[PDB]
What does this fold into?
Amino acid sequence: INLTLIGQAIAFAFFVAFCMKFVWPPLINAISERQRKIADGLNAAEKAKA
Amino acid sequence: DLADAQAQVKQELDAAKAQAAQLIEQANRRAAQLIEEARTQAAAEGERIRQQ
It folds into this structure.
């Protein structure tokens, strides 16, 4: 179509924003499942303790 | 169950120690009884020798 560099300018700018600005709430999210696995391994060790 | 485990461990150790007390107290008491009985036997035997 037409170049209309305005579109690509806004696309890159708002992309970099909407990604870096909100990488962090995702980075929060990785931990919950991992620690759930921690719980489900420790409850596995408890029976050996028995 | 992990919490239950240590309670059962202690409830076994204390019972084992009670068994320790009871049987070790019984043994030496029986030994003293045997000593007294042997002394009585010797008392009976010596006077028999003297009467003979």
User: Anything to note?
Assistant: Chain A touches chain B through four residues (CB under 8 Å). Residues 17 and 23 of chain A are 10 Å apart (CA to CA). Chain A is about 85% helix and 0% strand.
